[PDB]
Amino acid sequence: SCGAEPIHIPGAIQEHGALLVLSAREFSVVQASDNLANYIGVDLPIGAVATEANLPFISVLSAWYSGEESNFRYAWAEKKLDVSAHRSGTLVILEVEKAGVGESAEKLMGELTSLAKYLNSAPSLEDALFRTAQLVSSISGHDRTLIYDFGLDWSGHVVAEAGSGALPSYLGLRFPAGDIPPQARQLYTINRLRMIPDVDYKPVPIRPEVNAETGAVLDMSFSQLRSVSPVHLEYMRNMGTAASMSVSIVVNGALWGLIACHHATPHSVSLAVREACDFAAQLLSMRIAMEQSSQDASRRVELGHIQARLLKGMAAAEKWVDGLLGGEGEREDLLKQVGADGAALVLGDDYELVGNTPSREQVEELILWLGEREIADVFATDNLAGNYPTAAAYASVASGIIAMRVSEGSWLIWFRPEVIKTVRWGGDPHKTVQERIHPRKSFEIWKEQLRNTSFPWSEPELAAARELRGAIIGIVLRKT
């Protein structure tokens, strides 16, 4: 039920601006928000063509519409409004918000450069995330700005925070995946910005609900004024945030994380400042992606050093196994190939244990257990006792493993020990008030000792595992 609410078609906006939908062919009015007259100062009925008398920007909007610039922005000094628009099929969606008076563009510009200089010097990611949080905190004026990093399961945890003391500190807390369900996360991957200036706004309808040009209700995916999900607003109330504002951090086409801003009372942010925060997220995205590519490449080539050095040792060795484990350096490398603390090479009934392993009998019983599983190439887990409760007995030495079959009945398995982590959750991760699934009322810190879990296997490490398997597969077939 959770991810099925279509958040992109509510047929309504928030109060802090108004909305006009017009037909590209002729710029005739097709839909409007009920509050449009309160901003524009002219009705514009359905069917009405836009003219320079009522929309002074109409001349530049036509120009914008033919061009390539995906969005339109225009300062309407007359009415102190910021106007913006975008294309949606054959429609232009105009949004009008009150202009943010008393803000400086040199302020933004100067502040943005202080981050861009910082970000381009190759600094530690932690400090990049903090000062990015702290600029958005500076220029936005919220009570809390934080940076929320998604994990592989789409739970996320707070990795940076700036604030004014007025709201709680969530630095280092994990939050469960359902807090930002999948349709929200997909929307946020393509529309990278959102603002909710007042949690208790009364939704302002868009009439007619069905657009007469398309036959459908309006796709509000790129509407910055879109009315948000009712259930999320209970989340905000439950949290005690009267205003929020968030910006997607998109790295390599994927939603990496969020800059999340919250205020204790209501709060608004100008179109300009919101455009500035998107800029900040964009720079940080570039930092993150390069930090990843460089850490990966340097790890891949470091594993390459080890890989070939074992590859030549096995080839040059008489019995071959002695390339993997002939003396100090070969064993050392076998464990460093995949960043392991021990390993078991099993050639039928000949067991060889290197480094810190479980017992010969424990490994026997693991292999039997593995044999029943259907594994294509390699089996990796950071939590062996999840799928094999039995292995809770040797969690200190083999919480995580990579296992590689070799014959039909040999095996090569690496071991990683338990790392004890205390994870702090923003409220109980499992709790939801069932009825429609409603949000939990408490975000008090909820502790959880994490047991039987190793450091996770990096993708270079699994790649080296699969690589090393091939060389071994090709030698036992050759030897026989």
Binding residues for Ca(2+): 149-150
Q: Which residue has the tokens 């209700």?
A: 217
Question: Which is closer to a copy of itself, CB of 42 or CB of 75?
Answer: 42
Pick from Ca ion, a copy of itself, ligand BLA, none: which does 109 bind, CB < 5 to 8 A by kind? none
Binding-site residues for Mg(2+), in ranges, read 149-150
Torsions phi, psi of 17, nearest 5?
A: -165, -175
Name the residues that contact ligand BLA, by CB under 6 A. 2, 5, 7, 146, 148, 158, 170, 175, 178-181, 184, 194, 196, 228-229, 231-232, 235, 244, 246, 258, 260, 262, 432, 437, 439
Cis check: omega of the bond before 208, within 30 degrees of 0: yes
Pick from ligand BLA, a copy of itself, Ca ion, none: which does 45 bind, CB < 5 to 8 A by kind? a copy of itself
Please give the DSSP secondary-structure letter assigned to residue 227: P
User: x/- site string to a copy of itself, residues 183 to 222, per CB under 8 A?
Assistant: x-xx--x------------------------xxx--x---
Please choose, from the candidates 480, 470, 478, 479, the residue with its C-alpha nearest in 3D space to the C-alpha of residue 310: 470
Residue 330: CB atoms within 10 A of its CB come to 19
Question: Which is closer to ligand BLA, CB of 131 or CB of 262?
Answer: 262
Return the structure tokens found at 440.
């939990």
Question: How many residues of this chain interact with a copy of itself, rule: CB under 8 A?
Answer: 34
Pick from ligand BLA, Ca ion, a copy of itself, none: which does 215 bind, CB < 5 to 8 A by kind? a copy of itself
Torsions phi, psi of 265, nearest 5?
A: -100, 175
Return the structure tokens found at 275.
């455009």
Question: Which is closer to a copy of itself, CB of 190 or CB of 316?
Answer: 190
Identity of residue 44: L
Minimum distance of a copy of itself from residue 169's CB (angstroms):
27
Residue 470: CB atoms within 10 A of its CB come to 11
- Residues 147 and 135 sit within 8 Å (Cβ to Cβ): no
Minimum distance of a copy of itself from residue 310's CB (angstroms):
21
Q: After which residues is the chain broken (C to N over 2.5 A)?
A: 408, 435
User: What is the rounded distance in angstroms from the CA atom of residue 260 to the CA atom of residue 167?
Assistant: 13
Question: Which is closer to ligand BLA, CB of 63 or CB of 216?
Answer: 216
Please choose, from the candidates 343, 33, 357, the residue with its C-alpha nearest in 3D space to the C-alpha of residue 209: 33
Question: Which is closer to a copy of itself, CB of 101 or CB of 376?
Answer: 376
- Residues 422 and 458 sit within 8 Å (Cβ to Cβ): no
Minimum distance of a copy of itself from residue 254's CB (angstroms):
5
User: x/- site string to a copy of itself, residues 233 to 262, per CB under 8 A?
Assistant: -------------------xxx--------
Pick from a copy of itself, Ca ion, ligand BLA, none: which does 292 bind, CB < 5 to 8 A by kind? none
Return the structure tokens found at 289.
């992606």
User: What is the rounded distance in angstroms from the CA atom of residue 180 to the CA atom of residue 178?
Assistant: 5
Minimum distance of a copy of itself from residue 49's CB (angstroms):
6
Residue number of the CB closest to ligand BLA reads 246
- Residues 355 and 340 sit within 8 Å (Cβ to Cβ): yes
Pick from ligand BLA, Ca ion, a copy of itself, none: which does 102 bind, CB < 5 to 8 A by kind? none
User: x/- site string to Ca ion, residues 138 to 157, per CB under 5 A?
Assistant: -----------x--------
Q: 215: helix, coil or strand?
A: coil
Pick from Ca ion, a copy of itself, ligand BLA, none: which does 186 bind, CB < 5 to 8 A by kind? a copy of itself
Minimum distance of Ca ion from residue 149's CB (angstroms):
5
> Strand 17-23 relative to strand 243-251: parallel, antiparallel, unpaired?
unpaired
- Give, in degrees to the nearest 5, the angle at Cα 381 between 380 and 382: 135
Q: At what angle are helices 105-120 and 271-316 packed, to 10 degrees?
A: 10
Q: Where on the chain is the footprint of a copy of itself (CB under 8 A)?
A: 3, 25-26, 43-45, 47-49, 51, 89-90, 153-154, 177, 182-183, 185-186, 189, 214-216, 219, 252-254, 374-377, 459, 463, 466
- Which residues contact Ca ion by CB under 5 A? 149
